[PDB]
Structures are given as C-alpha cells and as structure tokens.
C-alpha cells in the first residue's frame, strides 16, 4: 500500500556532487513532511534533514550544513537532496522517511511540532572514494579436517562473488565480508573445510568474479 523507492546514488570522488530522488505513492504526499536519514556500513542511523508539507520549515543536521540542500515537488510526489563538496565521510546508505506531521497548535502560547517517522524506504547506496575501479589479486590459501581457500585482495569497488568447482562444491563453503584497506581497496576470503583424507584425489578451484571490471580469476588450491 505505502511505498518509497529511493534512487540516484553512485560512486563519487571527494569534492564532486550528486542529487538523490525519492518516489512516493500510496498516500497523500502533500499532507506529510519528509526526512532524509543515512546509515554508515554497519553503523547507527543518522538524521540529515527534513522538510515540511510545503516548505515552510526545513532544517539541516549540523554536519551536513553548508554542503547539502533539501527540496521537494509535491506535484510529482518527489523529494530531493543535493550534495556538494562531498566527503568520504558522507559515504553510507540513504533513506527517505515519512512523518504524519502531528503537532499542537496555539496562537498565543506557541507552535510546537512533533517528529517521528512512520514509513521507511529500502534506500540507495552512496560511495565516496578517490580510487579507480580495479581487478583483484587472488593468492592461494593452502593447508580430522583441514581448511583451504582464496585471498581476494585489493579491488574496487564492491562487490565480488566467489564459488568452487563452478558452484558444484557448496557444503562447507563460507564466503566472508569484505574489509576496507587503508588504501581504499577492498579484500576478503573464501574458506572451505573438507576431509583431510580425501586430498590428493579431489581438486579445489576458486572461481572469482569481479564484475565492475569484467575480471574472472581461477585458482586451483593444492597442499604445500
């Protein structure tokens, strides 16, 4: 019934700019204030800014002030966010929120509004780095059980996938999260525990696929 489909975000360089959009539908867009909230990878939620049902009132989070600008076009069911002089810090996920607008109105006592978001979207991803897309180097991690795998290191940007014997071997396989280097390059691993008695009779091939570079590395892992 209610929906919120964010869009627009991509990979930007420190200093560049970007403008995010938000499509609403399933409710009177005009009767609601809207919110922009971000969330760093695996970090807490952070409030960026908001905008009243018309525009009478719009505030910016202390950090994003002087760099960001919010806007809306009620005639198109859309919310907008312009981001200038970008920083690596600003890299995160981004959600547009919906608020009922609730408030208590007094003409001689003062206007006091209440803000709570009762409708979230899934969001769009923003990455701000000065690195250039690059394929990954794949080194072999060789060994009543034993573990072996691949070391997919130095690549950009996300993501990269992995498999074994062309998806044939699945049992015991665990592809890890990607850590972030001090160079701005990603890295990870793919371990596969197997019976250390069936070695020398079965082959183990690490099939890597970095798609933002069209690379496909195949390493066979054997004992040392």
């Amino acid at each position: 019934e209610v929906q919120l489909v964010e869009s627009g975000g991509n990979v930007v360089q420190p200093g560049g700019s970007l403008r995010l959009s938000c499509t609403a539908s399933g409710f009177s867009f005009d009767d609601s204030t809207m919110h922009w909230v971000r969330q760093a990878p695996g970090k807490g939620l952070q409030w960026v800014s908001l905008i009243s049902w018309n525009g009478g009132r719009t505030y910016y989070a202390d950090s994003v002030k002087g760099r960001f600008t919010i806007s809306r076009d009620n005639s198109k069911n859309s919310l907008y966010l312009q981001m200038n002089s970008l920083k690596t810090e600003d890299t995160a996920f981004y959600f547009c929120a919906k608020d009922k607008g609730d408030s208590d109105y007094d003409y001689n006592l003062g206007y006091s509004y209440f803000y709570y978001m009762d409708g979230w979207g899934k969001g769009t991803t923003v990455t701000v780095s000065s690195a250039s897309t690059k394929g990954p180097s794949v080194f072999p991690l060789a060994p009543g059980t034993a573990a072996l795998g691949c070391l997919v290191k130095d690549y950009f940007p996300e993501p990269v996938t992995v498999s074994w014997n062309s998806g044939a071997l699945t049992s015991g396989v665990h592809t890890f999260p990607a850590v972030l280097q001090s160079s701005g390059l990603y890295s990870l691993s793919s371990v596969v525990t197997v019976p250390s008695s069936s070695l020398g009779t079965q082959t183990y091939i690490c099939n890597v696929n970095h798609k933002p570079s069209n690379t496909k590395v195949d390493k066979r892992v054997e004992p040392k």
């Binding site: 939620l45 989070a61 665990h174 280097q181």
Partner: protein
C-alpha cells in the same frame, strides 16, 4: 542532546528483555523506538512513549522517566532478533537525535567455542613483494570475539583489519583478521601470533618463517 544506549543485550526465548535509553529530563521529550532487522528497512514499534501501532504485538511497551526511558519485550521469540534505536526531537537545536542502538540476541543454540586457523604469506604474494597473515575464526557462538596480533611477545596494532561476525550456513558464527607486513618485516621477527578472545577463553595459533 545525547542519547546513550547499550551495545547489546541477551535473553532466552520466554524471558522478557529491557532496553535503556536515557538523557537529562528526557520525560520532557516524546521518545520513539525503531526495529531494524539485518538488511530490511527500519520499523516503528513504539511512539509517543506509550502509544503503539496496530500490527505490533502486545509484547511491546514503553516507559519514560527521570533520566532513562525503557523499551520492554516479553515472551521473546526468535524473529525478534534485531537492532533497536530510540529517537526524539530536540527544540533548542531543531535536531532529530538517535541513539547508538542495541542488538537483541535471542539464545536458541548451545554456545560453542572458536576454531582459529592461521595462514602465512603465500609463496606467490611474497614474489610480489607483499606479505599478508590471515587469521580465520569459525564455528563459535555467540558472535562476539576479540582478536589481537603480536610479534615475538610484544603487542602489534599498526596495520591490522578485522571483519565482523557473520552467521554461517549451520547458523554458527565466523570472522576474519588480516595483518599486513613487508617481506623485510616478515623476515626480521621470528614468529607472529593470532590471539582470539571469546568470553574469557583465549584460543591461539602461531606461525613462523
């Protein structure tokens, strides 16, 4: 304005769970709680302190007093695992303010111990004039570890990275930890050691040139 929440809490299926969110005279503020499961989009569970949306089970309740407002979940189920954020609106700086968040860990598995495996610099990587020690901790529960590298007794922090626990296929947990050296540094020292700490215990493996 500051909202301080606890990192994590743990409960058993049945027992109830508390979650603290406190700030000076917070009673003046209308608190709201959000449930964000891994991946999906956040969800309002409780607003205006007590008020609760339909669709949210009676097992949710709100409180607010002095310097601490609390969120209570009863008859805790499995599908209740998630992160919970308290939020309020400030008036003297027109700020919406969030809290650190809290992980809800519903124990439905017999806690187990880590399995550390330490890989040394591969034959190729060294020919590339590079060196990377890879620590691999697997099959543990719950997902909460503490890694530390050392070179010949003396501690080592410069140039380390570590992933965050992630649920395997058998529902157990696993992590990663990389240490980057130059071949010169890899030769000078006599041994490097990966040290994992899991709820008191300290399982450790070591590799040398």
């Amino acid at each position: 304005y500051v909202l301080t929440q606890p990192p994590s809490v743990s409960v058993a299926p049945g027992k109830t769970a508390r979650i603290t969110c406190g700030g000076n005279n917070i009673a003046n503020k209308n608190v709201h709680w959000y449930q964000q499961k891994p991946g999906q989009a956040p969800v309002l569970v409780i607003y205006y302190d007590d008020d609760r949306p339909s669709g949210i089970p009676d097992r949710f309740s709100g409180s607010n007093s002095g310097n601490t407002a609390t969120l209570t979940i009863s008859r805790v189920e499995a599908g209740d695992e998630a992160d919970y954020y308290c939020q309020v609106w400030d008036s003297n700086s027109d700020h919406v303010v969030f809290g650190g968040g809290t992980q809800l860990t519903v124990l439905g598995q017999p806690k187990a111990a880590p399995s550390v495996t330490l890989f040394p610099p591969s034959s190729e990587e060294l020919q590339a004039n590079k060196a990377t020690l890879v620590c691999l901790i697997s099959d543990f529960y719950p997902g909460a570890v503490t890694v530390a590298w050392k070179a010949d007794s003396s501690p080592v922090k410069a140039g380390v990275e570590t992933t965050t626990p992630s649920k395997q296929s058998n529902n157990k947990y696993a992590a990663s930890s990389y240490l980057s050296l130059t071949p010169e540094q890899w030769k000078s020292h006599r041994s490097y050691s990966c040290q994992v700490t899991h709820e008191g215990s300290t399982v450790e493996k070591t590799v040398a040139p």
